[PDB]
Design a protein around this nucleic acid. Sequence first.
RNA 1: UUGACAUUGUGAAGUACUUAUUCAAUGAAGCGGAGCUCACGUUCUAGCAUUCAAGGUCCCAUUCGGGGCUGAUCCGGGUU
RNA 2: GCUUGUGACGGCCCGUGAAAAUCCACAGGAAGGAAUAGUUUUCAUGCCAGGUCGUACUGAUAACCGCAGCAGGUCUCCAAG
RNA 3: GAUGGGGAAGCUCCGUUUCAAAGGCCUGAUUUUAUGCAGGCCACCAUCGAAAGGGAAUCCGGUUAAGAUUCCGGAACCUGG
Lengths: 29, 103, 135, 77, 97, 91, 244
Amino acid sequence: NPLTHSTPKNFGIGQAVQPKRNLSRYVKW
Amino acid sequence: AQRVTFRRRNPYNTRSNKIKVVKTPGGILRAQHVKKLATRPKCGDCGSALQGISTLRPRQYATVSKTHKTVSRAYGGSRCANCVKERIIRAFLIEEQKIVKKV
Amino acid sequence: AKFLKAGKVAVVVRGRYAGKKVVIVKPHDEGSKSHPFGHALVAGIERYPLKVTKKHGAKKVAKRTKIKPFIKVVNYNHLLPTRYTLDVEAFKSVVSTETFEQPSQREEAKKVVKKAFEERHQAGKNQWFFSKLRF
Amino acid sequence: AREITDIKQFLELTRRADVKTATVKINKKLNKAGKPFRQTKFKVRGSSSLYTLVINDAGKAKKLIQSLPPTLKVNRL
Amino acid sequence: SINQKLALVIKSGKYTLGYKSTVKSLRQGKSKLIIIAANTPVLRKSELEYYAMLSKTKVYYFQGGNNELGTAVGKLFRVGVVSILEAGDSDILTTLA
Amino acid sequence: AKRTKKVGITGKYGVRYGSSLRRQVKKLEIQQHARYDCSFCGKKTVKRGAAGIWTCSCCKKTVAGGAYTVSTAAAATVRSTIRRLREMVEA
Amino acid sequence: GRVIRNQRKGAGSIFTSHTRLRQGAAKLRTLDYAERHGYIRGIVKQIVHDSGRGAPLAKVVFRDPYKYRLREEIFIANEGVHTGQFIYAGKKASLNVGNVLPLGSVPEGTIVSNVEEKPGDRGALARASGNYVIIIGHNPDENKTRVRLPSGAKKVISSDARGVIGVIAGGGRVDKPLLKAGRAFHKYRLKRNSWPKTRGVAMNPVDHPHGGGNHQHIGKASTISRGAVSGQKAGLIAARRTGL
RNA sequence: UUGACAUUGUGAAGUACUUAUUCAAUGAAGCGGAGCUCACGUUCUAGCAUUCAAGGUCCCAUUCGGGGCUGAUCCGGGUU
RNA sequence: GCUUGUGACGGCCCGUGAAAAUCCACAGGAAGGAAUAGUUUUCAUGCCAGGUCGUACUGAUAACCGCAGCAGGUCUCCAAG
RNA sequence: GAUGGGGAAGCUCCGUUUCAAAGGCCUGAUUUUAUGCAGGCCACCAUCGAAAGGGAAUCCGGUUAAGAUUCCGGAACCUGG
Ligand SMILES: [Mg+2]
Ligand SMILES: [Mg+2]
Ligand SMILES: [Mg+2]
Ligand SMILES: [Mg+2]
Ligand SMILES: [Mg+2]
Ligand SMILES: [Mg+2]
Ligand SMILES: [Mg+2]
Ligand SMILES: [Mg+2]
Ligand SMILES: [Mg+2]
Ligand SMILES: [Zn+2]
Ligand SMILES: [Zn+2]
């Protein structure tokens, strides 16, 4: 517990890189 | 007074066809093809040369040890000492401002 | 008015340890027989502890929390003072002017600081001191 | 191509399990202002480089001649 | 007006001109006021503020470049930062200046 | 000593191209090869490279400017106009 | 007769553009989520010179929002833009020189350059040195904006079209006389094969509709109608008026 | 270049919509509606930003680890 | 001194004077690792192999092109008193 | 200059990343046998184009009626394993 920290990432514009999301709506079929 | 000739097949005075005149142990003058001079590595932040790094051809860096291609500091063979100094000063002062700007 | 005390924390700017955080132990404001300039005796971190999560095993946590210390004399102009502090009363005796200029005594002082620094990392405190500066 | 100035490291190269030939060369050379002397160049033919040891005094040079292993073919002059 | 005040400090007080000398005074705690030119680089300007924050030293931002700040001190060369070691007959340490 | 009466730098062209044309180039050549004070370090070491590129010799700062001047008159008016607009748009 | 000179340029054998030393196509950043809902900060790494273009070029590096990478863009530098300056592009970007904003989010009278004819074409208007577009009003309904072009023509564009604040650098270039044919030779050497130009009246009737005759003269009216065909459009094309 | 006919459908009054057709971009990323709290994370500085994300919660059968939800709100698959 | 190589500089441009293969370093810390033992083949030394095609001579008032053993034409390096 | 496509009665024309489901080396899994199968990496998307451009590595001495930095003797270097 003392060695583990909560470090949330900012996913706003210009902040940390976006994570993997579901892009099924934009798939080039 | 003795005149020399090209030793390769190229008869044209190109960049890769430069010669130097030397005196052989046999007592005669003979042309000697030389290689193009190497260029010192340059810093990626200011463009200046880097100390402690050998000046070799690009493919000649694979036959030397790592000691000849870097120094014992962070960003050793990439950035010079002053540029690394500026990064640390910039990094520390800006991150302290982020805490201040939070409140 | 004075901040270069025996507990201040600074950042090394030159000489194989640039960007690594150290704590001042024995400052020397007015020169010395060697180093005829303002300097101080510091102990710092060369390899910072790695990040530990809840999924790491028992033995893997111990490996990732190893700390490699170093002891060096640094000029004042080659340091960047910070606003943080760290108590050095545990390992003040081992580091001194006699500690240097003796390879055997340099090694013995390092293992004392390593034990002191590591036990501080457990039961987390001075978290800014044990985080690697990014640059 | 390579010159060694230590007699101790010359002996170990002489028994490196790959050297098969050696040669000794005598040079009649003049000193800076003294009488002419003679120097001996002990050369060992390695698998990659030729090693040379230069001995200027004749007394020490004569001692090193019999120290060579008998299994090494030495070409005199 | 601080330009008239700076002249009195020159003939009656102690001052140091230059970035390196100013930093040395701040570390020693001998400084009491630092004057920063307008065209000072922000990275250098930020470092001086941090040094003054640790030593509890007031900071004044000069309204002009190093050409103008150097002229106020009375020198013929560009001056980046001026540190006031101790004022003489002037009252620059007790005013807004 | 003063070598030329009025041609100045345009003496390289001799008697060719006409006096009126030579006079016009003279005004734009002195400005092109002039020294300018850097606004980032205060030193008078700014000189033109290619047309529109102005770089300081000491701090190596490159600023985009006019063809033969570090700052044209129309660019100056834009900065004043932009400054005025940005003061009433954030208020 | 034969095929006249201006007809031969369409084939494009020796009349193509010399693009060996070009630094790239100067275009704005691709319109993405960040541009229309915020802003992204860029860095002016260096200002370079492009062959055949009077206006200097600025290289601005951005961060890819979706992958750990760095993207470089080639912009047309405006006046006052310097290396190391931060550039903000997007709807929420502040009104500063060198920033790229949609035309519908700026007050009237703003000076802009590298304007987009349509949202997403990455800059079409006011790209030459010293030219700029003046915004003369807005239209909140049906999302339109009125602008003034350097030629003096009023155009109506959508409010989502983008543009950079300022004036294209390198102005005043056309004020210095070339003073000789050598400098004109090197000027077009980096652009295309269109110099020198031979007068039609000095040719033969086979070569141009102006050549021939015992005196060097045109012979017919030089005002050619818009309805003429290829080989006839030599001279003044659809001239509303002539003279000084 | 101009008119007629075909491509060529839908609605209203004295121009409106979409599906044909046409134009443009993107290695088709955040579109439309609604719900949380006009907005709803980023502007002194030429630094840094990547390991299905740390943390929180719930499982495996505890071995070095593995897997859901949340973190990062739903609905419609119309890439814009 | 002559020829040539190179270094630091200066002048000129509305002219700013190629590209790719290939090699290297750094940031990063994913994994692998010591007590009766492992890794380093970027340190030294030792072992094996390197296929295919071109290679003679002229290069010109006689070996090239001009009907020819034609005073023409034809790219370039070395240069003594 | 092919392929995917679009023209042309047709020989063939356009086009080189274009309205395309366009591709493979780092391993783990298996000790039935060789490669099917588990996460991840990657999307640049033919090819041809310089014996004066870019470019891994050799020099001296001797030797023929006619060949050599290629042969001989000695002394080196580079690449791959
Ligand atoms: Mg004629
Ligand atoms: Mg005609
Ligand atoms: Mg006619
Ligand atoms: Mg031959
Ligand atoms: Mg013949
Ligand atoms: Mg084709
Ligand atoms: Mg090829
Ligand atoms: Mg070549
Ligand atoms: Mg021969
Ligand atoms: Zn540097
Ligand atoms: Zn400057």
